[PDB]
Amino acid sequence: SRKLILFIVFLALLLDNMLLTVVVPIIPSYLYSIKHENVQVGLLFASKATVQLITNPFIGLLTNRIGYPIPIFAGFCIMFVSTIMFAFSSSYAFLLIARSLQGIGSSCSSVAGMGMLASVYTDDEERGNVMGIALGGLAMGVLVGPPFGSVLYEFVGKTAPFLVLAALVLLDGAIQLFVLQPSRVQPESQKGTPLTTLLKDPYILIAAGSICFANMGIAMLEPALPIWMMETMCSRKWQLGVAFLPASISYLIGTNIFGILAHKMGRWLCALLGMIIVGVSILCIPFAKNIYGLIAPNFGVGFAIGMVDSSMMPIMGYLVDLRHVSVYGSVYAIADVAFCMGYAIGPSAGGAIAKAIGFPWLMTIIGIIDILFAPLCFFLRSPP
Ligand SMILES: NCCc1c[nH]cn1
């Protein structure tokens, strides 16, 4: 019964994304009051991604030395401490510390869980099938985070969503202790194909670049779209809120269906078509005149990014087996670094560009870049 390991990675990713999305509404409002009674706010937002990017390679190396369960449980402990600090700390410095620890725990959870899922699901088809579910864990977390945080903030109080998240994290830790049992440190058999050799690989680089650009598109789109909506359409707050909902719904459906549909169609073809579709949707976003015009391109963006992720993570695992030794911590650290590359410089660079040139020009540039990179996914196809 290795399904319990899938549940642990699903719960870990889901709770991580719940915390990440509950935090985004609550933190600016709380700060916009203590200061009374641009640089630092962006630093607080990007600290999680920056620290996760920094500590991904170290966790990738550590998983080879001490196995996966100890990093997974450590990621749990760090996440629980970060949740408690979010609950009870009300200073900006402590908020930054909590964000940095959340990033460290996110790195541990993501890298170790993806490596463990790759190692226990050695089959090519089942690897993608379960990684679709694991990736849909993040989509479910993103979907059910903001409403959960909002209702628990409005009805009970500020610390209630964080306390409930901490209780759910404690239950996740109890089941982790029951199934993983990190009683002792165990090493893996062989070495790990040092990162210097993995990054020289053109195919691993192509997969990481496709993931990075597909995620950077949405990472620049998500914070820079509401500003342009207020500039042009003068939409209401709730319209600014439900505009990106189709992207999340479509990402969930696309991930959960293409985790299985990518093997029969071809993972390279799925990534190529995903890049083309996300580029086309990003190009067509600026032409929408109202929310009803933005309903479909956001769906396309989310669907295509789901295809890209669900086809490219199993490509990373397959490439490490095909050309290197079968150790996955380092390669999935590479993939996580590719994700946080978009997640870190996404908002700031996107805003800077949208200030220098118009928002439609930024969207056009992102779309043409994605479409131009799409042919590069052809080289990922198997020789036969
Ligand atoms: N690691 C986050 C993957 C993702 C979800 N949505 C967009 N990208």
mmCIF file of C-alpha atoms and ligand atoms in Angstrom:
data_model
loop_
_atom_site.group_PDB
_atom_site.id
_atom_site.type_symbol
_atom_site.label_atom_id
_atom_site.label_comp_id
_atom_site.label_asym_id
_atom_site.label_seq_id
_atom_site.Cartn_x
_atom_site.Cartn_y
_atom_site.Cartn_z
ATOM 1 C CA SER A 1 0.000 0.000 0.000
ATOM 2 C CA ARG A 2 2.136 2.898 -1.346
ATOM 3 C CA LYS A 3 -1.094 4.972 -1.749
ATOM 4 C CA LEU A 4 -0.464 6.384 1.789
ATOM 5 C CA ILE A 5 2.862 7.917 0.540
ATOM 6 C CA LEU A 6 0.849 9.607 -2.296
ATOM 7 C CA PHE A 7 -1.657 10.887 0.323
ATOM 8 C CA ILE A 8 1.217 12.319 2.451
ATOM 9 C CA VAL A 9 2.665 14.245 -0.583
ATOM 10 C CA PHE A 10 -0.890 15.333 -1.600
ATOM 11 C CA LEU A 11 -1.672 16.571 1.936
ATOM 12 C CA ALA A 12 1.721 18.264 2.267
ATOM 13 C CA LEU A 13 1.394 20.113 -1.044
ATOM 14 C CA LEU A 14 -2.254 20.993 -0.381
ATOM 15 C CA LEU A 15 -1.570 22.419 3.088
ATOM 16 C CA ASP A 16 1.478 24.295 1.798
ATOM 17 C CA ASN A 17 -0.637 25.958 -0.887
ATOM 18 C CA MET A 18 -3.453 26.658 1.592
ATOM 19 C CA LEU A 19 -1.001 28.524 3.813
ATOM 20 C CA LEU A 20 0.557 30.320 0.829
ATOM 21 C CA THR A 21 -2.856 31.536 -0.405
ATOM 22 C CA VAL A 22 -4.423 32.326 3.045
ATOM 23 C CA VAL A 23 -1.328 34.505 3.779
ATOM 24 C CA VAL A 24 -1.643 36.682 0.607
ATOM 25 C CA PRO A 25 -4.919 38.531 1.649
ATOM 26 C CA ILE A 26 -4.284 38.775 5.460
ATOM 27 C CA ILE A 27 -0.654 40.083 5.551
ATOM 28 C CA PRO A 28 -0.996 43.405 3.547
ATOM 29 C CA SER A 29 -4.126 44.520 5.481
ATOM 30 C CA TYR A 30 -2.538 43.801 8.907
ATOM 31 C CA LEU A 31 0.642 45.731 7.921
ATOM 32 C CA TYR A 32 -1.412 48.657 6.464
ATOM 33 C CA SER A 33 -2.520 49.322 10.065
ATOM 34 C CA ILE A 34 0.434 48.704 12.396
ATOM 35 C CA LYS A 35 2.611 51.020 10.299
ATOM 36 C CA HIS A 36 0.013 53.779 10.656
ATOM 37 C CA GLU A 37 -0.368 53.042 14.380
ATOM 38 C CA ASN A 38 6.671 48.769 -2.177
ATOM 39 C CA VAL A 39 10.148 47.474 -1.371
ATOM 40 C CA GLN A 40 9.586 45.693 1.942
ATOM 41 C CA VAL A 41 6.167 44.340 0.927
ATOM 42 C CA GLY A 42 7.597 42.861 -2.266
ATOM 43 C CA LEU A 43 10.534 41.502 -0.280
ATOM 44 C CA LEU A 44 8.127 39.785 2.121
ATOM 45 C CA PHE A 45 6.146 38.355 -0.798
ATOM 46 C CA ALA A 46 9.229 37.064 -2.642
ATOM 47 C CA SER A 47 11.217 35.848 0.386
ATOM 48 C CA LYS A 48 9.436 32.483 0.401
ATOM 49 C CA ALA A 49 10.263 31.803 -3.249
ATOM 50 C CA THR A 50 13.818 33.129 -2.907
ATOM 51 C CA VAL A 51 14.660 30.992 0.128
ATOM 52 C CA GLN A 52 13.012 27.934 -1.431
ATOM 53 C CA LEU A 53 15.103 28.474 -4.568
ATOM 54 C CA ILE A 54 18.239 28.821 -2.440
ATOM 55 C CA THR A 55 17.645 25.682 -0.358
ATOM 56 C CA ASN A 56 16.349 23.380 -3.115
ATOM 57 C CA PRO A 57 19.824 22.036 -4.104
ATOM 58 C CA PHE A 58 20.800 21.450 -0.472
ATOM 59 C CA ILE A 59 17.657 19.384 0.127
ATOM 60 C CA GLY A 60 18.333 17.539 -3.120
ATOM 61 C CA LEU A 61 21.774 16.564 -1.845
ATOM 62 C CA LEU A 62 20.486 15.797 1.664
ATOM 63 C CA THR A 63 17.837 13.351 0.434
ATOM 64 C CA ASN A 64 20.614 11.222 -1.071
ATOM 65 C CA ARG A 65 22.501 11.099 2.242
ATOM 66 C CA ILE A 66 19.697 10.596 4.775
ATOM 67 C CA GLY A 67 16.784 9.344 2.673
ATOM 68 C CA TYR A 68 13.409 10.968 2.032
ATOM 69 C CA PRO A 69 11.370 10.443 5.255
ATOM 70 C CA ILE A 70 13.593 12.600 7.485
ATOM 71 C CA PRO A 71 13.440 15.578 5.064
ATOM 72 C CA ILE A 72 9.669 15.111 4.737
ATOM 73 C CA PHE A 73 9.155 15.130 8.505
ATOM 74 C CA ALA A 74 11.514 18.099 8.871
ATOM 75 C CA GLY A 75 9.472 19.949 6.262
ATOM 76 C CA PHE A 76 6.399 19.186 8.348
ATOM 77 C CA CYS A 77 8.021 20.514 11.522
ATOM 78 C CA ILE A 78 9.194 23.697 9.816
ATOM 79 C CA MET A 79 5.757 24.216 8.238
ATOM 80 C CA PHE A 80 4.059 23.811 11.624
ATOM 81 C CA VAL A 81 6.403 26.329 13.250
ATOM 82 C CA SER A 82 5.826 28.759 10.371
ATOM 83 C CA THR A 83 2.048 28.375 10.695
ATOM 84 C CA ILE A 84 2.204 29.034 14.438
ATOM 85 C CA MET A 85 4.398 32.095 13.870
ATOM 86 C CA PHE A 86 1.920 33.379 11.275
ATOM 87 C CA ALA A 87 -0.823 32.846 13.852
ATOM 88 C CA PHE A 88 0.804 34.674 16.766
ATOM 89 C CA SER A 89 3.452 37.037 15.335
ATOM 90 C CA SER A 90 2.414 40.561 14.336
ATOM 91 C CA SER A 91 5.787 42.155 13.513
ATOM 92 C CA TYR A 92 7.232 42.589 10.040
ATOM 93 C CA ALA A 93 10.563 40.973 10.950
ATOM 94 C CA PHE A 94 8.815 37.956 12.467
ATOM 95 C CA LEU A 95 6.570 37.835 9.398
ATOM 96 C CA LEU A 96 9.698 37.673 7.232
ATOM 97 C CA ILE A 97 11.137 34.902 9.415
ATOM 98 C CA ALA A 98 7.889 32.936 9.148
ATOM 99 C CA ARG A 99 7.887 33.383 5.365
ATOM 100 C CA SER A 100 11.500 32.201 5.100
ATOM 101 C CA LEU A 101 10.759 29.109 7.182
ATOM 102 C CA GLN A 102 7.659 28.478 5.072
ATOM 103 C CA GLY A 103 9.931 28.554 2.033
ATOM 104 C CA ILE A 104 12.394 26.126 3.624
ATOM 105 C CA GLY A 105 9.597 23.730 4.549
ATOM 106 C CA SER A 106 8.115 24.101 1.071
ATOM 107 C CA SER A 107 11.462 23.149 -0.455
ATOM 108 C CA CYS A 108 11.771 20.117 1.821
ATOM 109 C CA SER A 109 8.202 18.955 1.182
ATOM 110 C CA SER A 110 8.240 19.478 -2.589
ATOM 111 C CA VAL A 111 11.677 18.026 -3.335
ATOM 112 C CA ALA A 112 11.514 15.096 -0.913
ATOM 113 C CA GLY A 113 7.923 14.194 -1.791
ATOM 114 C CA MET A 114 8.535 14.310 -5.535
ATOM 115 C CA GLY A 115 11.689 12.233 -5.114
ATOM 116 C CA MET A 116 9.880 9.671 -2.972
ATOM 117 C CA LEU A 117 6.967 9.488 -5.415
ATOM 118 C CA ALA A 118 9.440 8.934 -8.246
ATOM 119 C CA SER A 119 11.318 6.245 -6.309
ATOM 120 C CA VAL A 120 8.281 4.263 -5.140
ATOM 121 C CA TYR A 121 6.467 4.612 -8.498
ATOM 122 C CA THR A 122 9.256 3.358 -10.742
ATOM 123 C CA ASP A 123 6.944 2.647 -13.688
ATOM 124 C CA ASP A 124 6.827 5.371 -16.326
ATOM 125 C CA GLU A 125 3.032 5.402 -16.649
ATOM 126 C CA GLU A 126 2.211 5.195 -12.936
ATOM 127 C CA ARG A 127 4.782 7.904 -12.185
ATOM 128 C CA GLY A 128 2.914 10.396 -14.351
ATOM 129 C CA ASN A 129 -0.454 9.108 -13.151
ATOM 130 C CA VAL A 130 0.389 9.784 -9.499
ATOM 131 C CA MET A 131 2.326 12.988 -10.184
ATOM 132 C CA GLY A 132 -0.832 14.347 -11.773
ATOM 133 C CA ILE A 133 -2.604 13.790 -8.449
ATOM 134 C CA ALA A 134 0.298 15.279 -6.489
ATOM 135 C CA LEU A 135 0.324 18.374 -8.714
ATOM 136 C CA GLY A 136 -3.457 18.655 -8.438
ATOM 137 C CA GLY A 137 -2.860 18.845 -4.708
ATOM 138 C CA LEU A 138 -1.372 22.311 -5.204
ATOM 139 C CA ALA A 139 -4.309 23.279 -7.428
ATOM 140 C CA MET A 140 -6.804 22.185 -4.770
ATOM 141 C CA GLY A 141 -4.861 24.125 -2.146
ATOM 142 C CA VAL A 142 -4.837 27.270 -4.278
ATOM 143 C CA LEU A 143 -8.561 26.927 -4.992
ATOM 144 C CA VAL A 144 -9.696 26.309 -1.408
ATOM 145 C CA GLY A 145 -7.214 28.602 0.345
ATOM 146 C CA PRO A 146 -8.569 32.134 -0.146
ATOM 147 C CA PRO A 147 -12.260 31.383 0.583
ATOM 148 C CA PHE A 148 -11.293 29.352 3.659
ATOM 149 C CA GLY A 149 -9.100 32.142 4.988
ATOM 150 C CA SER A 150 -11.740 34.769 4.248
ATOM 151 C CA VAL A 151 -14.588 32.954 6.002
ATOM 152 C CA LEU A 152 -12.504 32.087 9.060
ATOM 153 C CA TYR A 153 -11.223 35.670 9.231
ATOM 154 C CA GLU A 154 -14.708 37.179 8.971
ATOM 155 C CA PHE A 155 -16.523 34.875 11.396
ATOM 156 C CA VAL A 156 -14.094 33.667 14.070
ATOM 157 C CA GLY A 157 -11.018 35.880 13.929
ATOM 158 C CA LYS A 158 -7.581 36.513 12.506
ATOM 159 C CA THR A 159 -5.799 33.583 14.174
ATOM 160 C CA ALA A 160 -8.561 31.043 13.460
ATOM 161 C CA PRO A 161 -7.521 30.102 9.878
ATOM 162 C CA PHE A 162 -3.912 29.674 10.989
ATOM 163 C CA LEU A 163 -4.905 27.592 14.018
ATOM 164 C CA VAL A 164 -7.108 25.342 11.874
ATOM 165 C CA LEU A 165 -4.281 24.997 9.352
ATOM 166 C CA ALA A 166 -1.974 24.080 12.242
ATOM 167 C CA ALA A 167 -4.408 21.393 13.412
ATOM 168 C CA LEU A 168 -4.616 19.956 9.891
ATOM 169 C CA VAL A 169 -0.814 20.044 9.709
ATOM 170 C CA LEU A 170 -0.641 18.214 13.050
ATOM 171 C CA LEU A 171 -2.953 15.512 11.696
ATOM 172 C CA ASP A 172 -0.748 15.273 8.600
ATOM 173 C CA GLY A 173 2.241 14.845 10.905
ATOM 174 C CA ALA A 174 0.500 12.131 12.899
ATOM 175 C CA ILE A 175 -0.230 10.137 9.753
ATOM 176 C CA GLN A 176 3.332 10.832 8.536
ATOM 177 C CA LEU A 177 4.737 9.428 11.782
ATOM 178 C CA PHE A 178 2.449 6.419 11.401
ATOM 179 C CA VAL A 179 3.365 5.606 7.780
ATOM 180 C CA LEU A 180 6.830 7.101 7.209
ATOM 181 C CA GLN A 181 8.247 6.415 10.696
ATOM 182 C CA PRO A 182 11.435 8.523 10.492
ATOM 183 C CA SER A 183 12.998 6.596 13.364
ATOM 184 C CA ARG A 184 16.509 6.355 11.898
ATOM 185 C CA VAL A 185 18.585 7.947 9.152
ATOM 186 C CA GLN A 186 19.114 5.648 6.191
ATOM 187 C CA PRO A 187 21.276 6.362 3.128
ATOM 188 C CA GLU A 188 20.434 5.552 -0.449
ATOM 189 C CA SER A 189 22.520 2.970 -2.276
ATOM 190 C CA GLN A 190 24.424 4.905 -4.945
ATOM 191 C CA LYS A 191 25.601 8.436 -5.709
ATOM 192 C CA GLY A 192 23.416 11.128 -7.207
ATOM 193 C CA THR A 193 24.967 12.329 -10.488
ATOM 194 C CA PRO A 194 26.232 15.657 -9.103
ATOM 195 C CA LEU A 195 24.291 18.772 -10.063
ATOM 196 C CA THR A 196 27.175 19.960 -12.241
ATOM 197 C CA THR A 197 26.588 16.963 -14.524
ATOM 198 C CA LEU A 198 22.785 17.240 -14.438
ATOM 199 C CA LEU A 199 22.723 20.916 -15.433
ATOM 200 C CA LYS A 200 25.054 20.229 -18.368
ATOM 201 C CA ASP A 201 22.339 17.946 -19.776
ATOM 202 C CA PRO A 202 20.597 19.716 -22.685
ATOM 203 C CA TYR A 203 17.351 17.744 -22.265
ATOM 204 C CA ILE A 204 17.006 18.352 -18.524
ATOM 205 C CA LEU A 205 17.739 22.005 -19.286
ATOM 206 C CA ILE A 206 15.032 22.058 -21.975
ATOM 207 C CA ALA A 207 12.448 20.544 -19.628
ATOM 208 C CA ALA A 208 13.395 22.925 -16.811
ATOM 209 C CA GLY A 209 13.243 25.897 -19.176
ATOM 210 C CA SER A 210 9.818 24.913 -20.482
ATOM 211 C CA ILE A 211 8.533 24.588 -16.914
ATOM 212 C CA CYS A 212 10.172 27.891 -15.965
ATOM 213 C CA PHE A 213 8.698 29.864 -18.861
ATOM 214 C CA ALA A 214 5.231 28.313 -18.594
ATOM 215 C CA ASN A 215 5.138 29.156 -14.884
ATOM 216 C CA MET A 216 6.725 32.597 -15.359
ATOM 217 C CA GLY A 217 3.919 33.534 -17.732
ATOM 218 C CA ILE A 218 1.278 32.987 -15.062
ATOM 219 C CA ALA A 219 3.534 34.391 -12.321
ATOM 220 C CA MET A 220 3.733 37.672 -14.240
ATOM 221 C CA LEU A 221 0.077 37.507 -15.307
ATOM 222 C CA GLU A 222 -1.535 36.975 -11.901
ATOM 223 C CA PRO A 223 -0.411 40.180 -10.091
ATOM 224 C CA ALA A 224 -0.205 42.431 -13.174
ATOM 225 C CA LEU A 225 -3.692 41.643 -14.518
ATOM 226 C CA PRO A 226 -5.846 43.309 -11.803
ATOM 227 C CA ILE A 227 -3.945 46.590 -12.193
ATOM 228 C CA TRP A 228 -4.715 46.653 -15.918
ATOM 229 C CA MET A 229 -8.325 45.692 -15.178
ATOM 230 C CA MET A 230 -8.689 48.662 -12.830
ATOM 231 C CA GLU A 231 -6.971 50.874 -15.409
ATOM 232 C CA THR A 232 -9.203 49.837 -18.323
ATOM 233 C CA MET A 233 -12.473 48.163 -17.293
ATOM 234 C CA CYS A 234 -12.860 49.788 -13.836
ATOM 235 C CA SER A 235 -14.242 46.492 -12.570
ATOM 236 C CA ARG A 236 -15.478 45.821 -9.049
ATOM 237 C CA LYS A 237 -13.431 44.123 -6.333
ATOM 238 C CA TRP A 238 -15.354 40.850 -6.591
ATOM 239 C CA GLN A 239 -14.841 40.897 -10.364
ATOM 240 C CA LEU A 240 -11.107 41.341 -9.759
ATOM 241 C CA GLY A 241 -11.348 38.336 -7.444
ATOM 242 C CA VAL A 242 -13.298 35.861 -9.587
ATOM 243 C CA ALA A 243 -11.393 36.723 -12.774
ATOM 244 C CA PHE A 244 -8.500 34.344 -12.058
ATOM 245 C CA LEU A 245 -10.785 31.577 -10.762
ATOM 246 C CA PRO A 246 -11.164 30.011 -14.258
ATOM 247 C CA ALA A 247 -7.378 29.707 -14.408
ATOM 248 C CA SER A 248 -7.306 27.678 -11.183
ATOM 249 C CA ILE A 249 -10.284 25.485 -12.124
ATOM 250 C CA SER A 250 -8.832 24.763 -15.560
ATOM 251 C CA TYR A 251 -5.394 24.086 -14.067
ATOM 252 C CA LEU A 252 -6.944 21.508 -11.735
ATOM 253 C CA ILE A 253 -8.836 19.744 -14.534
ATOM 254 C CA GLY A 254 -5.907 19.900 -16.945
ATOM 255 C CA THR A 255 -3.413 18.520 -14.441
ATOM 256 C CA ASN A 256 -5.694 15.716 -13.269
ATOM 257 C CA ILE A 257 -6.572 14.620 -16.814
ATOM 258 C CA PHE A 258 -3.218 15.140 -18.538
ATOM 259 C CA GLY A 259 -1.266 13.235 -15.908
ATOM 260 C CA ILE A 260 -2.808 10.234 -17.669
ATOM 261 C CA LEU A 261 -3.361 11.681 -21.153
ATOM 262 C CA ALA A 262 0.295 12.711 -21.593
ATOM 263 C CA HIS A 263 1.685 9.182 -21.895
ATOM 264 C CA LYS A 264 -0.577 8.020 -24.731
ATOM 265 C CA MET A 265 -0.294 11.261 -26.717
ATOM 266 C CA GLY A 266 3.406 11.742 -26.001
ATOM 267 C CA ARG A 267 4.882 13.897 -23.246
ATOM 268 C CA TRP A 268 6.884 15.982 -25.720
ATOM 269 C CA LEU A 269 3.735 16.627 -27.763
ATOM 270 C CA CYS A 270 1.761 17.502 -24.637
ATOM 271 C CA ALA A 271 4.404 20.041 -23.598
ATOM 272 C CA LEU A 272 4.603 21.499 -27.116
ATOM 273 C CA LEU A 273 0.834 21.933 -27.328
ATOM 274 C CA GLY A 274 0.700 23.312 -23.787
ATOM 275 C CA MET A 275 3.300 25.963 -24.578
ATOM 276 C CA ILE A 276 1.490 26.878 -27.803
ATOM 277 C CA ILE A 277 -1.887 27.112 -26.048
ATOM 278 C CA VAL A 278 -0.601 29.179 -23.120
ATOM 279 C CA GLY A 279 1.180 31.521 -25.529
ATOM 280 C CA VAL A 280 -1.957 31.966 -27.630
ATOM 281 C CA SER A 281 -4.106 32.593 -24.549
ATOM 282 C CA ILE A 282 -1.650 35.136 -23.131
ATOM 283 C CA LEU A 283 -1.586 36.882 -26.516
ATOM 284 C CA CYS A 284 -5.392 36.986 -26.632
ATOM 285 C CA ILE A 285 -5.824 38.236 -23.037
ATOM 286 C CA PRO A 286 -5.212 41.964 -23.795
ATOM 287 C CA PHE A 287 -7.944 42.030 -26.457
ATOM 288 C CA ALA A 288 -10.734 41.206 -23.992
ATOM 289 C CA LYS A 289 -13.080 44.108 -23.269
ATOM 290 C CA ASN A 290 -14.619 42.758 -20.041
ATOM 291 C CA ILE A 291 -14.560 39.753 -17.705
ATOM 292 C CA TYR A 292 -16.604 37.637 -20.119
ATOM 293 C CA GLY A 293 -13.825 38.109 -22.664
ATOM 294 C CA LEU A 294 -11.232 37.077 -20.063
ATOM 295 C CA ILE A 295 -13.125 33.940 -18.995
ATOM 296 C CA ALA A 296 -11.837 31.792 -21.877
ATOM 297 C CA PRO A 297 -8.165 32.893 -22.184
ATOM 298 C CA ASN A 298 -7.631 32.317 -18.454
ATOM 299 C CA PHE A 299 -9.098 28.832 -18.857
ATOM 300 C CA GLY A 300 -6.683 28.212 -21.718
ATOM 301 C CA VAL A 301 -3.731 29.487 -19.681
ATOM 302 C CA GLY A 302 -4.517 27.275 -16.701
ATOM 303 C CA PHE A 303 -5.275 24.213 -18.822
ATOM 304 C CA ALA A 304 -2.065 24.601 -20.830
ATOM 305 C CA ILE A 305 0.089 25.097 -17.734
ATOM 306 C CA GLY A 306 -1.474 21.962 -16.267
ATOM 307 C CA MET A 307 -0.514 20.074 -19.420
ATOM 308 C CA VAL A 308 3.025 21.471 -19.248
ATOM 309 C CA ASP A 309 3.599 20.517 -15.607
ATOM 310 C CA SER A 310 1.939 17.090 -15.770
ATOM 311 C CA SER A 311 3.982 16.241 -18.858
ATOM 312 C CA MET A 312 7.306 17.738 -17.750
ATOM 313 C CA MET A 313 7.795 16.400 -14.216
ATOM 314 C CA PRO A 314 7.679 12.741 -15.377
ATOM 315 C CA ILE A 315 10.006 13.823 -18.195
ATOM 316 C CA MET A 316 12.515 14.910 -15.555
ATOM 317 C CA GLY A 317 12.260 11.552 -13.739
ATOM 318 C CA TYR A 318 12.501 9.632 -17.057
ATOM 319 C CA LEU A 319 15.551 11.652 -18.242
ATOM 320 C CA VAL A 320 17.455 10.884 -14.981
ATOM 321 C CA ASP A 321 16.718 7.121 -15.452
ATOM 322 C CA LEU A 322 17.518 7.177 -19.215
ATOM 323 C CA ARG A 323 20.923 8.955 -19.066
ATOM 324 C CA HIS A 324 21.957 9.038 -15.389
ATOM 325 C CA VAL A 325 21.627 7.001 -12.200
ATOM 326 C CA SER A 326 18.127 6.647 -10.749
ATOM 327 C CA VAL A 327 18.235 9.228 -7.963
ATOM 328 C CA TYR A 328 15.505 11.856 -8.160
ATOM 329 C CA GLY A 329 16.114 14.307 -5.311
ATOM 330 C CA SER A 330 18.571 16.417 -7.293
ATOM 331 C CA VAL A 331 16.544 16.550 -10.517
ATOM 332 C CA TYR A 332 13.356 17.449 -8.683
ATOM 333 C CA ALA A 333 15.334 20.113 -6.836
ATOM 334 C CA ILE A 334 16.199 21.408 -10.316
ATOM 335 C CA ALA A 335 12.502 21.385 -11.224
ATOM 336 C CA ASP A 336 11.598 23.185 -7.991
ATOM 337 C CA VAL A 337 14.257 25.818 -8.716
ATOM 338 C CA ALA A 338 12.671 26.223 -12.149
ATOM 339 C CA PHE A 339 9.312 26.844 -10.455
ATOM 340 C CA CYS A 340 10.623 29.364 -7.917
ATOM 341 C CA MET A 341 12.542 31.184 -10.661
ATOM 342 C CA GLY A 342 9.188 32.255 -12.065
ATOM 343 C CA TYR A 343 7.597 32.570 -8.631
ATOM 344 C CA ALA A 344 10.332 34.893 -7.277
ATOM 345 C CA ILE A 345 11.078 37.479 -9.985
ATOM 346 C CA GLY A 346 7.605 37.099 -11.493
ATOM 347 C CA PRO A 347 5.634 39.878 -9.796
ATOM 348 C CA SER A 348 8.454 42.427 -9.494
ATOM 349 C CA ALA A 349 9.830 42.102 -13.030
ATOM 350 C CA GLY A 350 6.324 41.903 -14.475
ATOM 351 C CA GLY A 351 5.331 45.119 -12.736
ATOM 352 C CA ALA A 352 8.537 46.856 -13.796
ATOM 353 C CA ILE A 353 7.966 45.873 -17.434
ATOM 354 C CA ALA A 354 4.281 46.839 -17.302
ATOM 355 C CA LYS A 355 5.433 50.236 -16.049
ATOM 356 C CA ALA A 356 8.144 50.642 -18.700
ATOM 357 C CA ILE A 357 5.943 49.404 -21.562
ATOM 358 C CA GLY A 358 2.216 48.808 -21.674
ATOM 359 C CA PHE A 359 0.617 45.737 -20.145
ATOM 360 C CA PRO A 360 -0.505 44.464 -23.596
ATOM 361 C CA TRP A 361 3.121 44.667 -24.732
ATOM 362 C CA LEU A 362 4.223 42.591 -21.736
ATOM 363 C CA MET A 363 1.568 39.986 -22.537
ATOM 364 C CA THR A 364 2.582 39.965 -26.210
ATOM 365 C CA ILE A 365 6.242 39.454 -25.268
ATOM 366 C CA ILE A 366 5.401 36.587 -22.909
ATOM 367 C CA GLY A 367 3.203 34.951 -25.542
ATOM 368 C CA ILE A 368 5.750 35.193 -28.346
ATOM 369 C CA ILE A 369 8.472 33.882 -26.018
ATOM 370 C CA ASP A 370 6.332 30.868 -25.099
ATOM 371 C CA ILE A 371 5.454 30.166 -28.737
ATOM 372 C CA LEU A 372 9.113 30.466 -29.779
ATOM 373 C CA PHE A 373 10.198 28.109 -26.993
ATOM 374 C CA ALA A 374 7.471 25.582 -27.859
ATOM 375 C CA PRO A 375 9.435 23.915 -30.739
ATOM 376 C CA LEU A 376 12.280 23.195 -28.314
ATOM 377 C CA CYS A 377 10.062 20.563 -26.668
ATOM 378 C CA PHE A 378 10.467 18.458 -29.826
ATOM 379 C CA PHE A 379 13.950 17.343 -28.745
ATOM 380 C CA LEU A 380 12.501 15.698 -25.618
ATOM 381 C CA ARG A 381 10.887 12.921 -27.668
ATOM 382 C CA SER A 382 12.242 9.408 -27.315
ATOM 383 C CA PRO A 383 14.446 8.162 -30.191
ATOM 384 C CA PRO A 384 11.937 5.487 -31.120
HETATM 385 N N1 LIG B 1 4.975 24.456 -8.161
HETATM 386 C C1 LIG B 1 3.802 25.202 -8.576
HETATM 387 C C2 LIG B 1 3.262 24.654 -9.895
HETATM 388 C C3 LIG B 1 2.224 25.577 -10.527
HETATM 389 C C4 LIG B 1 0.890 25.587 -10.260
HETATM 390 N N2 LIG B 1 0.334 26.522 -11.004
HETATM 391 C C5 LIG B 1 1.302 27.099 -11.733
HETATM 392 N N3 LIG B 1 2.457 26.502 -11.424
#
